[PDB]
Nucleic acid binder design. Structure first.
Lengths: 96, 108, 81, 94, 94, 108, 96, 81
DNA sequence: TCACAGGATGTATATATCTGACACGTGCCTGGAGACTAGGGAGTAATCCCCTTGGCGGTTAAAACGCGGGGGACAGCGCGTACGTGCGTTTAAGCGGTGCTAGAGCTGTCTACGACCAATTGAGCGGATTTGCATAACAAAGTCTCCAGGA
DNA sequence: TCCTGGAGACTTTGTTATGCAAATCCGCTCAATTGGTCGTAGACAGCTCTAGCACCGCTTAAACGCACGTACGCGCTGTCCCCCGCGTTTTAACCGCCAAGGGGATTACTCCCTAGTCTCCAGGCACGTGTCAGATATATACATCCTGTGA
C-alpha cells in the first residue's frame, strides 16, 4: 500500500487554489441562493448572467480575505486548526 | 482657416484631452474647468496606466506569454506596494491571489 | 425557492479557506461560514435591488451589483464601472 | 444605434510603449477601463472639494495637482506630478 | 461685518419639543451642527449619483428617498421616509 | 398682495426649507433641484435630529442634569444600535467610552 | 501596613478612565510632537490652538480603539498581559 | 525640536490602554505604541499641511485637520464640520 | 477549607458659594418669498428584438458516505521572573499674566479668462474579415514523499 | 539516532493539431476644434485687527526611580478524540440544444415644471445684558475588599 500523511495534501491544495483564478464554488446552487435571498425584498426579480457572476466574485473575495485573517488568529493562538471564534474575532476587529 | 488639431498631440499624450475636459465639466464636479485642467489630468491617468501595464507585461513574460490577462494585472499590482495601496480595495475579476503560505504551516 | 444555503457545499468552503492559507478546518467552521456569507449577500443584494427599483426595472444588471458593492468599501473591476 | 466611450484604444497604445510585442485580452482591457474610471472619479471628486473649500468655481491644474498628492502614494505622486506639470507647461507653449 | 449660517436655532427648538425643560451646552450644539452637515452631504451626494447613473439632471424627492435608505439602517430609514413623504405630500397639497 | 412666509411652516417642519433648496443646489450636487426635494430632506434631517436629542436628554437625566453635553450625545448614539452605525466612526470631542470591561479580567 | 493586591487597582483605573472625558496625553508634550513631525516636511509652519486639540483627540481616539482590539487579541490567546504582537495582529487584520 | 515622542510618557500610554479596557501591559508595549501613534499622527498632519499649502497659508486651522482626518474614515465632530 | 470582622480605604451624597457660560433681548441687512416669464427635461405611448426563463437528454466529474489511525488540541503542573504596588524624590506642565506683530480677513479695481454660439469635419465607433495564440491531447523526464532496513 | 536509496506518485517539460478570440480593415456619423463675442471670477494692492508666539515667575500635580513580593507566562508532559486521507457509491452540475415572449432600449411629441428675473421685508445674525446650573471646596455617610483569627 501507499499513501500520503495528513498535512501533506492540505499544503498542495493551498498552493494550487492560491494560484488559480476560477471559482471554487458551484454555480447553480449559488444562483439559487442569490434568488432565495433576493425574493425576501421583492418577488418576481430577474438577473442578468453577468450580475450573478459579479456577486460570486465579490463573495469569494470576501470570504478568502476573511479566511486569511482567521488563519492568522489561529496562528496567534498557536494553532493550525481554525475555529468559528477565530472568524468571529477577525470580523469584530474589522467593525462587523 | 487653420486645420483642426487634437490637443492630445500638443501635450504629447495618448489619452484624449477634449473628452476629459467634458467629463470634468459634468459629473457635477464644478461650474467651470480650466484650460490646463484636463491636460494635467490626462497626463496623470496615462502615467498610472503605463505603470500597471509595464509591470503586467513583465508578469506576462514571466508566465511565458505574449499577452496580458487579468491575472497578470493582479500580480503586477501587488508586486508594487505603491499600487497595492492605491488599489488596496479593488477586486480583480479572475485575479486570483498571491501564493503565500505561512512558515509555521510548513513541514519539518 | 428554498434551502440554497446548504447549496454551499463543504468542499467549496474548504477550497475558499485554502486560498486564505488555511490548512486545517474544524468541523464547526462550515456553519459559521455560511452565516457570514449570507449576511454579505443580503447586504449586497438588498442594495442592488434598491438601485434596480429606483430605475423602475425588474432585471438586476451588473451595474446594479457593482454600485451596491462599491459603497460598502469594495470596488469591483471587470464587470463595468 | 447608440454609441459608447471607453479607453480601450489608449490603453492598447500605452501597452506598446512599455511592451511593443505584447497584446492584451478583452478581460484585461475590461479591468483597465474600470481602473481609469476609478482614478478619474477620485481626482475629480477631491479637486471639486478643494475648489469648494477655497471658494472657487474653476478647477485648474492646481486642484488636480493637490488632489493627486492626497490620493496617490508619495512615489507615484511625484512621477504623476512631473508628467502633469509638463503637459500643462507644454500645452501652454504649444 | 461678515456673516455665518448654522443650525443652532433649529436644533434648539427640536430639543424643546422633546424635553421642554432642558438646555444644550455650546459644545453639544457644535456637535449637532457637524452632525447635520454630515448627514446632509451624504444624502445629497448619493442623490446626485443616482441622477447621474440614470442620466438625469434633476433631483427630486425620490432620489433623496432612495439615498435615505442606502444611508440609514432600515429602522431609521422608514421613519425618515414616512416623515419625508408627508412633508412633501402636504407641501404640494398646500 | 399675499403675505410671504417660510416653507418650513407650510411643511410643518422646524428645519429651514429655502436654505436646503439652496444647499442642495450648490456644492454642485446637481444641475437642478425639484420643488419637493428640499422639503423631503429637511424632514429627514429633523427626524434624525430629534432622535439623538431625545436619547441624550435621557442620558442627561441619568446624571441628574437639566442640560445636554457632548458626553450625553455619545451615550445616546452608542446605546442606540442604528445610530451606532450611521455615526459608527464619528469621533466626538470629549465623548469618552462605554464602561466595557471584559469578564475575563474580573477578579475571582 | 496595608496594601491593595495586583490587578485590583488596575480595575479601578479602568473604570475611571473609561468614565471620564478629559484628555490623557499632556498638552505641551503633544503640541511639540506635532511640530517635531511637521517640521520635517515644512519649516515655519504654525498651528491654531484648536487645530492642535483636534489632532490630539483624534490621536487618543485612535490609540484607545487600538488598545481595545489589542486587548481582545490577547484574550483570544488566553492572556491578560498585552504584547506588541497583539497590537500588530489587530492592525494587520484591519489591513494597516 | 527633537525627541518629543518620549513626551508621551508611560502613564499616558497606560491610561489610554486602560480606557480601552487593558489591564496589564508588557514592557515592550511602550515602544511599539509610540511607533503606531506617530504614523497615525504624521499622516494626519501631512494631509492637513497639504490643504494648508493649497490655500496658500502658513497657519493650520482646525478645518484642515478635520478634512485631513475625515477622508481616512474619521469624521470628527465638535471642531466644525 | 470557609465564613465573618473590622480596618482602612475609596466613592457617593448633601451643603453652601459664586461665577461665567448660557438664555434671552435689541437692532439691522441680506436672502428668502411673491408674482412673473420662457424653454428644454422628463413623462408618456408605441415599437422593435435581445436576452432570460424554462425544459430535455446524456455524460461525467464532484459531492456523500464510511473506515482507520495518527497529530494536534486540550488540561494540568512547576519554575522563575517581569510586572504591579507604594514610598520618597525630582521635574516640568499648568496657570495667569505681559507685550509684539505676522498673517488672516475684508475691501475695492481691473483684467484676462472660460462659457457660449455657429460652422466644419476627422477621430472614434460598430461591424466584417483574418490568422495566430492559447487550448487540449499525449508521452517523457524530473522533483519530491515516505518507508525499511543498515552504518 | 539518522541516513540512505529505492519505490512510488505527482508535477513539469516538451511535442502536436485545432478553434475561436483578438487584431486589423472599412465606412459612417457627430463630438472635437476654429474662431469669434460676452460678462465676471480671480489676481492684486492695500489696510485693519485678531490670534499666535515668546517670555516671565510660582504652585504643585505628575512623572521618575527603587524595592519587595507575587500572580502570571511559559515550557513540558500525557491522554484522547477529531480531522485527515483513501476507496466505493450516488448525486446533481455541465454542456449543447431549442422555443417563447417579457422587458430593456429606442424614437417621437407634449407640456409643465423649474431656472432666471425684479421687487420687497422679516428671519436670522452679531452683539449686549441678565441670571442660575453647574463647578468648588468641604464635610459626611456608605460600600467593598484584604488579611486575620477562629470554625
Amino acid at each position: 500500500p501507499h499513501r500520503y500523511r495528513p498535512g501533506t495534501v492540505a499544503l498542495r491544495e493551498i498552493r494550487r487554489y492560491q494560484k488559480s483564478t476560477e471559482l471554487l464554488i458551484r454555480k447553480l446552487p449559488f444562483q439559487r441562493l442569490v434568488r432565495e435571498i433576493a425574493q425576501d425584498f421583492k418577488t418576481d426579480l430577474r438577473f442578468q448572467s453577468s450580475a450573478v457572476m459579479a456577486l460570486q466574485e465579490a463573495c469569494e473575495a470576501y470570504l478568502v480575505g476573511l479566511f486569511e485573517d482567521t488563519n492568522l488568529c489561529a496562528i496567534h493562538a498557536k494553532r493550525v486548526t481554525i475555529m468559528p471564534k477565530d472568524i468571529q474575532l477577525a470580523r469584530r476587529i474589522r467593525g462587523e | 482657416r487653420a486645420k483642426a488639431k487634437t490637443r492630445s498631440s500638443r501635450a504629447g499624450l495618448q489619452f484624449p484631452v477634449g473628452r476629459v475636459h467634458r467629463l470634468l465639466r459634468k459629473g457635477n464636479y464644478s461650474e467651470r474647468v480650466g484650460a490646463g485642467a484636463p491636460v494635467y489630468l490626462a497626463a496623470v491617468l496615462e502615467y498610472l496606466t503605463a505603470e500597471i501595464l509595464e509591470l503586467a507585461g513583465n508578469a506576462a513574460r514571466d508566465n511565458k506569454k505574449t499577452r496580458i490577462i487579468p491575472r497578470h494585472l493582479q500580480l503586477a499590482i501587488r508586486n508594487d506596494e505603491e499600487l497595492n495601496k492605491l488599489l488596496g480595495r479593488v477586486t480583480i475579476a479572475q485575479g486570483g491571489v498571491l501564493p503565500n503560505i505561512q512558515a509555521v504551516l510548513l513541514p519539518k | 425557492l428554498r434551502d440554497n444555503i446548504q447549496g454551499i457545499t463543504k468542499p467549496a468552503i474548504r477550497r475558499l479557506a485554502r486560498r486564505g492559507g488555511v490548512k486545517r478546518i474544524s468541523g464547526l467552521i462550515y456553519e459559521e461560514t455560511r452565516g457570514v456569507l449570507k449576511v454579505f449577500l443580503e447586504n449586497v443584494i438588498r442594495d442592488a435591488v434598491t438601485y434596480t427599483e429606483h430605475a423602475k426595472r425588474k432585471t438586476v444588471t451588473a451595474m446594479d451589483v457593482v454600485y451596491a458593492l462599491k459603497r460598502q468599501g469594495r470596488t469591483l473591476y471587470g464587470f463595468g464601472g | 444605434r447608440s454609441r459608447k466611450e471607453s479607453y480601450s484604444i489608449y490603453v492598447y497604445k500605452v501597452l506598446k510603449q512599455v511592451h511593443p510585442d505584447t497584446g492584451i485580452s478583452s478581460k484585461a482591457m475590461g479591468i483597465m477601463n474600470s481602473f481609469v474610471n476609478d482614478i478619474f472619479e477620485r481626482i475629480a471628486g477631491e479637486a471639486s472639494r478643494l475648489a469648494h473649500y477655497n471658494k472657487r468655481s474653476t478647477i485648474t491644474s492646481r486642484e488636480i495637482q493637490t488632489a493627486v498628492r492626497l490620493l496617490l502614494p508619495g512615489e507615484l505622486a511625484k512621477h504623476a506630478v512631473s508628467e502633469g506639470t509638463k503637459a500643462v507647461t507644454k500645452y501652454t507653449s504649444a
